[PDB]
Design a protein around this ligand. Structure first.
Ligand SMILES: *[C@@H]1O[C@H](CO[C@@H]2O[C@@H](C)[C@@H](O)[C@@H](O)[C@@H]2O)[C@@H](O[C@@H]2O[C@H](CO)[C@@H](O)[C@H](O)[C@H]2NC(C)=O)[C@H](O)[C@H]1NC(C)=O
Ligand SMILES: *[C@@H]1O[C@H](CO)[C@@H](O)[C@H](O)[C@H]1NC(C)=O
Lengths: 274, 99, 8
């Protein structure tokens, strides 16, 4: 199926405490595989997935130097945005960037993207065309004009269609045993009493990969999505994910509800009852 | 913009006393990024805690996972304590083995 | 490999 390469970058200033903290975290699909943290003793790009041991010393040195260069660029941006927004030098501010590309099963580009945020709000983003930018406010409009005059879109497009895609294919090839695997969900239902002759039925899906999954509760053959409570799919600490979805039902009528689990690792969806 | 972190505590495998497991504290939907996350065993901070899976959603709120290997006991209690600017006081969420 | 970012 399709796969993605994403980098989550965060720069946070801290007036009075020295230089801003700078972090870069990379993911291939839903798996963290590399990380850079300026607050580490000796900041360096580091592998976060076992298969990255396949990259030689040059890779780590190159990514580390690039990260330090990016860190310096963001230090400048934090200062620049204080000016654009006419803010004080004593407050903490955050810049966030998500950059990435997605390819189909054949390794060809599906889409690329790069979006910026300042203090948790949209700042500027590359449009789907990979040619123009969309600015959220007048400060971002200044940036948009600067980048157009410098031809930044063309440079970024080259990265997205070329560098990003090519590295993603390489990571998928080297880490195939991990990234192309399928771990089937194991499910179970828990029961909890409530006041007013009602019960909470919670359906759990554990140890699966990839992260995409669908959990629904049914009654009489119809789904109860609007009556369900749930948590966003979440990492379980070992590279797998988990999720739960619950519904409140009448005491004594539990046997009438069924949990359905759909996943890449389930040739036939699972159907469970309490 | 200030979003209060959602704190979720859970194990990798259904808890079975004496059997190795992984305890997770997923802290999500928060902003600003500065945060303090501590995992506790019987009220005492756990030392080996690994931080991973830092990302942010479409609305830019932050997500991060704290996890540690552990072997559950019938009497041991576990919790996750979080300090963040959106909250006046630290917040502790206990592991509910029967959830 | 992450992209190189430049000043806004
Ligand atoms: C994963 O792929 C390997 C092939 O190796 C990949 O390509 C290399 C150039 C290098 O980049 C590796 O890190 C990559 O993992 C598969 O191993 C081969 O399997 C075939 C049979 O299917 C066998 O004849 C070859 O001798 C194997 N070669 C190796 C690398 O030992 C491996 O099976 C794949 N894993 C799964 C199950 O997805
Ligand atoms: C910036 O804010 C200060 C007050 O904090 C104000 O005096 C000044 O006019 C502002 N700058 C502009 C050009 O809006």
């Amino acid at each position: 199926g399709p796969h993605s390469l994403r980098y989550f970058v965060t720069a946070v200033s801290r007036p009075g405490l020295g230089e801003p903290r700078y972090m870069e975290v990379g993911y291939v699909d839903d798996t963290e595989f590399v990380r850079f943290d300026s607050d580490a003793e000796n900041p360096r790009y580091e592998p976060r997935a076992r298969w990255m041991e396949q990259e030689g010393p040059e890779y780590w040195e190159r990514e580390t130097q690039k990260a330090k260069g990016n860190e310096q660029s963001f230090r400048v941006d934090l200062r620049t945005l204080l000016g654009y927004y006419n803010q004080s030098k004593g407050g903490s501010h955050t810049i966030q960037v998500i950059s990435g590309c997605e390819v189909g099963s054949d390794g060809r580009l599906l889409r690329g993207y790069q979006q910026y945020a300042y203090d948790g709000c949209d700042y500027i983003a590359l449009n789907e065309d990979l040619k123009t930018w969309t600015a959220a406010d007048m400060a971002a409009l200044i940036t948009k004009h600067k980048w157009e005059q410098a031809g930044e879109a063309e440079r970024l497009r080259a990265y997205l269609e070329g560098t990003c895609v090519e590295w993603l294919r390489r990571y998928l090839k080297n880490g195939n045993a991990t990234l192309l695997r399928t771990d089937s969900p194991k499910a179970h239902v828990t029961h909890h009493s409530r006041p007013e002759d009602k019960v909470t039925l919670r359906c759990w899906a554990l140890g699966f990969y990839p992260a995409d999954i669908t959990l629904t509760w049914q009654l009489n053959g119809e789904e109860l999505i609007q009556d369900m409570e749930l948590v966003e799919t979440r990492p379980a600490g070992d590279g797998t994910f988990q999720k739960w979805a619950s519904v409140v039902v009448p005491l004594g009528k539990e046997q009438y509800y069924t949990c359905h689990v759909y996943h890449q690792g389930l040739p036939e969806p699972l159907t469970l009852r309490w | 913009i200030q979003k209060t972190p959602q704190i979720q505590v859970y194990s990798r495998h259904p808890p079975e006393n004496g059997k190795p497991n992984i305890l997770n504290c997923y802290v999500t939907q928060f902003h600003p990024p500065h945060i303090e996350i501590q995992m506790l065993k019987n009220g005492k901070k756990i030392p080996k805690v690994e931080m991973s899976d830092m990302s942010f959603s479409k609305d830019w709120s932050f997500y991060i996972l704290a996890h540690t290997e552990f072997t559950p006991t019938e009497t041991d209690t576990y919790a996750c304590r979080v300090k963040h600017d959106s909250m006046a006081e630290p917040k502790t969420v206990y592991w509910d083995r029967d959830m | 490999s992450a992209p190189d970012t430049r000043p806004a």
